[PDB]
Subunit: 114 residues, 3 copies
Amino acid sequence: PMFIVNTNVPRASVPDGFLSELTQQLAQATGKPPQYIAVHVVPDQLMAFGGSSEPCALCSLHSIGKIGGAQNRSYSKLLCGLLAERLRISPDRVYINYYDMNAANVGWNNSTFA
Amino acid sequence: PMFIVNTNVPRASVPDGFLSELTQQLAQATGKPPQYIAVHVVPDQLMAFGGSSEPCALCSLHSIGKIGGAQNRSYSKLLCGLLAERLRISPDRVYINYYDMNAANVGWNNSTFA
Amino acid sequence: PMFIVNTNVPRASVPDGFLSELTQQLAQATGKPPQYIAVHVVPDQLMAFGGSSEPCALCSLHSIGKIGGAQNRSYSKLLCGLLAERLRISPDRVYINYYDMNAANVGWNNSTFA
Ligand SMILES: O=c1ccc2cc(O)c(O)cc2o1
Ligand SMILES: [Cl-]
Ligand SMILES: [Cl-]
Ligand SMILES: [Cl-]
Ligand SMILES: [Cl-]
Ligand SMILES: [Cl-]
Ligand SMILES: [Cl-]
Ligand SMILES: [Cl-]
Ligand SMILES: [Cl-]
């Protein structure tokens, strides 16, 4: 899976070890091996949420499977909790788009997962 | 909904009020309340469009519904118009990908919209 | 089509002419005119792959058609090869997500491709 967070919070406010925490928590939540988890955090962005530039985040999670109604509710609670605790972003200022990718549409290591 | 614009135009050429204009115009165009509109502008990017690096933009609009043939033509006229007027990007150097998101695949506030 | 690469490799390691190489190689690979190929390279990112901060890349290719099982395997070999040769990123530290876009969902030049 791949998790991306774009935020207006400054880089210096992203704590040390945040990418590793995201990797470990996503491996556990999605069931996927840590080897297959990629994470990307983009601070210092020019963004607004509801017209306000108070701290906010726009995120995405792409995964081959492990996406669905109940699972995405669970991921949203986990990820909003991490963003609130570590980046001090209110959960009502976070969107996370979820994508269930077909294995044929994910390239890796000179091939695809199909 | 969420609107993202990535552009090679420099940050100093993004005028004051641009995120607010996008928020308000997208609220009107999508019919969704502005409280629900998130916007993200990414200037100074390393980009080419058709092999050249005159001003260009790559954008996306994600929305739960309010996406379709006619609506997307209307969004493109509105958004290209704003990028031309405010960022001086020619409409023929803009791509906007549209995504009609299922409510279960949009997280917010510790849950999803489903 | 649109190709985006996000990577932790530094900007100075992206060779001169890389955007043009991606444009031309993608025009050939997809069969589409170079005028329609847009490319975006984002270096210096805060990213991890498999928990590791060694060089990695997260990429996407969006195209109206020219996406499928065999084509995506061929694109992945081409693109991993370019990232390995030009950016020194190991292919097993690259993801590429592929998207077959409906023409009605790709805006351009005040309208869509539909
Ligand atoms: O999904 C959303 C996004 C923003 C938002 C803002 C509000 O003030 C509210 O009452 C509900 C909301 O729901
Ligand atoms: Cl995956
Ligand atoms: Cl589920
Ligand atoms: Cl897919
Ligand atoms: Cl929405
Ligand atoms: Cl429509
Ligand atoms: Cl969806
Ligand atoms: Cl295309
Ligand atoms: Cl589509």
